Amino acid sequence: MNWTGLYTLLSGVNRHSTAIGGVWLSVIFIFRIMVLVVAAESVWGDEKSSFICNTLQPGCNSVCYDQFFPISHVRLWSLQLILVSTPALLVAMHVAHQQHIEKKMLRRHKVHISGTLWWTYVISVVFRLLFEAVFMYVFYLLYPGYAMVRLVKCDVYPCPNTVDCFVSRPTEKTVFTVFMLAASGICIILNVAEVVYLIIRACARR
Amino acid sequence: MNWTGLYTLLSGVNRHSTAIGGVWLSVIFIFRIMVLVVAAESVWGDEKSSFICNTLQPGCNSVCYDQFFPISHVRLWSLQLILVSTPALLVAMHVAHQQHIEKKMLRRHKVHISGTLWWTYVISVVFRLLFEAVFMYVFYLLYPGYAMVRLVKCDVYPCPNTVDCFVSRPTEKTVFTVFMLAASGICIILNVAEVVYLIIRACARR
Amino acid sequence: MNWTGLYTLLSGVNRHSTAIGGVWLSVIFIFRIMVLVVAAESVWGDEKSSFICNTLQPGCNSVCYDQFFPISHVRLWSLQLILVSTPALLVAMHVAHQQHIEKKMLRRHKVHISGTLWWTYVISVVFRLLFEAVFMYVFYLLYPGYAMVRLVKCDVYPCPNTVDCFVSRPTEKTVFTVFMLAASGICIILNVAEVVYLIIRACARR
Amino acid sequence: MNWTGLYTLLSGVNRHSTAIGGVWLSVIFIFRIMVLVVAAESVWGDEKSSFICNTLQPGCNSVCYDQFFPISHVRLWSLQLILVSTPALLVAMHVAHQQHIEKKMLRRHKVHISGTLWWTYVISVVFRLLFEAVFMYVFYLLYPGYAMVRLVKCDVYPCPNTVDCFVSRPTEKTVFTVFMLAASGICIILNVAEVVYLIIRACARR
Amino acid sequence: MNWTGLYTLLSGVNRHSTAIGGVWLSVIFIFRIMVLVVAAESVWGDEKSSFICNTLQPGCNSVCYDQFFPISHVRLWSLQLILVSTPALLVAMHVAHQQHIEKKMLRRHKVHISGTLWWTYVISVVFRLLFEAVFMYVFYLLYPGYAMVRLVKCDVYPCPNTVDCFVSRPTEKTVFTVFMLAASGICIILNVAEVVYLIIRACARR
Amino acid sequence: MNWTGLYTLLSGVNRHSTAIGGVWLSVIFIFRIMVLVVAAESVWGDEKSSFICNTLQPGCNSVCYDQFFPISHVRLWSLQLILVSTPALLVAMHVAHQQHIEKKMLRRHKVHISGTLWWTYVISVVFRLLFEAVFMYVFYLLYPGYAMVRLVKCDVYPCPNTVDCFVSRPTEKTVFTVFMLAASGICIILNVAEVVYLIIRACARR
């Protein structure tokens, strides 16, 4: 967590920025990171010992938790943040290597190289948008809606009876889920707007 | 936690400051951050195992805690701090992008752009004030007053009898709640004063 | 924890220093911070599971601990450190904003502004002294003397019998309490000496 | 975790880069590091207490876990990351020492020394590729395929009966295993492409 | 933990150094810090749950541990390190304030001020030596010799019978105790040598 | 963990380097540090609760663990790393003080001082080699060979019967032991080669 390094990396100013992209996208990314960290360290936490089921035979609780919860929300959000951040750092090191090549040249074709850099930036933005969309889809597929069930009836082996049990903190997890979904949706909208602005600028150049 | 980066970000000097805003607001923000960190790591802590209820049937304690405590105070305070900090970092990266545009121009309209930056700063201050007010309202709605109840009578399923149980540390949580509320109220007052000072300056310009 | 940032902030050199103030006060502050960190992470630690009472009915131990210990020593010391540090960072960001105003002016009244800065520094020192004194008073009020009781007789509900129980580590806590009190007293003496020196300098100016 | 230091070390720009190597390889390395950290701290975690087996005789669970799981996936991935990172930091300190020798010379043969540096870079890339390949092979040898078994029948001493027991989180571990394997395969492909590009450049020089 | 800041602070070069002082003393101080950190986080650790006694009545183990171990070795070593480090940071901020006064003068008496700084450095070295000696004495007083007892017979209330119990890790603690004592003794010898060298230099000046 | 500081300290470039020493030795040192950290935090971990023995009388397990394991492998490796790092930081602060003396001189004998610095570097290298060798010897003395026993028969008091019990993770510890031993052996070979190269250079000078 550094103030100087985070701006030089997450913003992704690169060749050109629309003042509707890197700034707002970086703001939403930082908000998402902070909310995810708070959710992971505090409310989900261990999220395995807290889930307790009314049974005496050992191992029923563990297998039941995996049956009802295949992959936790925090894992999905962390994976999504990593995947979304990947194109930004990609273009950041790409620009660093481009400036290294420029300083090597110091020690027509350059215009073409810069144009290729612009194309890489555009395709990176598109890939980030697709990653966000597919992560929203997989989140919808794994969990319907937004609310979290409180009581679950368990029948898997080795649970000898249809015991019922409870989730750790339903309401806090619901609130944080709503926050994360809203932030991701705003990020998708901002990315689409940035792509449209880039298309408008390209048409204006022509 | 860095001395140099925190001032360049939290202060939000931006286009102009009234010497009644960024300095005092940043001081109160740092105090709030430190108090929240101390409260989270030390007194609330896990805040789930400590809450113990006089019952033998497993799962009664967990569901009872969620019934009485929907969302913990620490979660509300952390969410409020993130939401309040969001406009400050927003204007910080906005000014960074503006200076990037300025250095690009180096490599009438500028006055208009700077005026738009000033308007963005003003609207960011207003949004921060509204966020603080709505967080105070939701805190009041969730918990009446400031003191924390010590003994709670539990009747939810699967608690077979109306067992009664106790909170971990009532007095320390009460003190920290009072501290957090007082700091937030002072922050709201300071924000309102800054808005009034900005209005006075704008009228003086006219 | 940074060497460069801590000196530029905790020293509070500001407009003027007496070479009896910021240096010695910063030294005692750093010593207090280190001792408090050592006490919190190591000896008090969790300070809730360690406190064990001879009872079988659950919840007796928890409520008994709050009855005998309303607010822990570590919480009081951390609160005192935050409150004492608040004026120092206050004047630090105040001087940062003053130098920002100076660089803006670069891009009679200045003497008056600097005098107001000096007055703010003086009033900040006074407020720090008052905070230290009131924290010493509240520490005395909550706990008489310095030694820590070892055996406590508990009679609160739901403890069915007058069971007796023991504190985790009496002697280490006693030693750290003595250290913290001595450091705070030395800090108060140093602050009073600095105020007297400032008064002497002001009279010398007149 | 620093933005400035990580680029100057992991990129391995060295004597020359193909703009297909250090940038993409560093991106995949950072992604692998983040995924491994998330997997270690969150999903595998302790990975010993979570593995619970239906037995009452103590020590059966512990020895059974080692029988079925000789070395954990997280340990293999961390070892692989360290081994792969070793040549990169090797060439980084090698270039630092080369520039130290250059500044000493400041205070024909130089061309030969630079050529030897280029050869060291090439052999380092080859060694990194071999390390990646051998780690993939050992991962395949230890665990067949990618899916993780859920129920295991245990017969080792001192487990008096053929008790059966369950893994902590099969599906999350499966997903993270797939992620890690895909990232490593992409890294191997990129390394092979970089070696081929270096061979093409060498032939072009001749 | 920073490379640049630690040298500028712990060395205490100040007005003058004998090349037998700050360098070797800083080396031994860093070694002591590392050994203490390793001992605290790893071998002593919690050092309360590990100490287990053969009794069923609760609270016997806790009070027995305090009876036999008044203050832990790690606490004594950390206190000694803080107290020894205090004069070094004292003279460091003193020199910082002196250079601030010098830059203020830029914006006979100076020789006298520098001589007073030299006297402060000498008295700080003496105080560090006295602190080291008194800490060695208190360590000897609290624990005779160096070896750690393994079996202790406990008779304090509320232990109804003279139960006997065992320390967590005798041999590792013995080794680390020997390391810490040897390092402290070497530090005392080095401080005495530095004082003697300073006296010799002062006589040479006369 | 900083990229800039670690190179300026661990490399130990000092007066002169053979390009066979500081670079390769620093690489192996960094690898050893990373492997030790991974081994400590993950596989050995607590290494006390995991060791479980088939007994009901409390205290048998604890004393039995100390009987079979006097000092853990992780403690030996950490001690060895600290002892080996001590000469490197020694010469680093020595060179810092030498350059301070040089800047003081700026504000025949110098050749002799530089020669003494070279001799200090040589003797530091020799001491590092001796420390590595003696640590290998003590590791061999404490544990024969490399494999870790799985089942141990315990007969010490207060274990009323010759109960047998198991180590936590034999195979992972075996692998990490082999890694650590191989890295240390390579480091010894590199140190011997550096000493021989220094002798060859000294003879070449004569």
Swiss-Prot record, chains A, B, C, D, E, F:
Changing residue 85 to C: In CMTX1; mutant have a higher open probability than hemichannels formed of GJB1 wild-type. Changing residue 60 to F: In CMTX1; moderate. Changing residue 95 to M: In CMTX1; non-functional channel. GO terms for biological process: cell-cell signaling; gap junction assembly; nervous system development. It is a multi-pass membrane protein. It is found in: Cell membrane; Cell junction, Gap junction. The chain crosses the membrane at residues 23-45, 76-95, 117-139, 178-200. Changing residue 128 to W: In CMTX1; moderate. Keywords: Cell junction, Cell membrane, Charcot-Marie-Tooth disease, Dejerine-Sottas syndrome, Disease variant, Gap junction, Membrane, Neurodegeneration, Neuropathy, Phosphoprotein, Transmembrane, Transmembrane helix. Changing residue 34 to V: In CMTX1; localized in the Golgi apparatus but also forming rare small gap junction-like plaques. GO terms for molecular function: gap junction channel activity; identical protein binding. Changing residue 34 to I: In CMTX1; localized in the Golgi apparatus but also forming rare small junction-like plaques. Changing residue 102 to G: In CMTX1; mild phenotype; increased sensitivity to acidification-induced closure. Changing residue 191 to S: In CMTX1; mild. Changing residue 201 to W: In CMTX1; mild/moderate; non-functional channel. Changing residue 150 to W: In CMTX1; moderate. Changing residue 172 to K: In CMTX1; non-functional channel. Changing residue 206 to G: In CMTX1; localized mainly on the cell membrane forming gap junction-like plaques. Residues 1-22, 96-116 are cytoplasmic. One of its GO terms (cellular component) is connexin complex. Changing residue 187 to R: In CMTX1; severe. A connexon is composed of a hexamer of connexins. Interacts with CNST. It is linked to Charcot-Marie-Tooth disease, X-linked dominant, 1: A form of Charcot-Marie-Tooth disease, a disorder of the peripheral nervous system, characterized by progressive weakness and atrophy, initially of the peroneal muscles and later of the distal muscles of the arms. Dejerine-Sottas syndrome: A severe degenerating neuropathy of the demyelinating Charcot-Marie-Tooth disease category, with onset by age 2 years. Characterized by motor and sensory neuropathy with very slow nerve conduction velocities, increased cerebrospinal fluid protein concentrations, hypertrophic nerve changes, delayed age of walking as well as areflexia. There are both autosomal dominant and autosomal recessive forms of Dejerine-Sottas syndrome. This is Gap junction beta-1 protein. It comes from Homo sapiens (Human). The gene is GJB1.
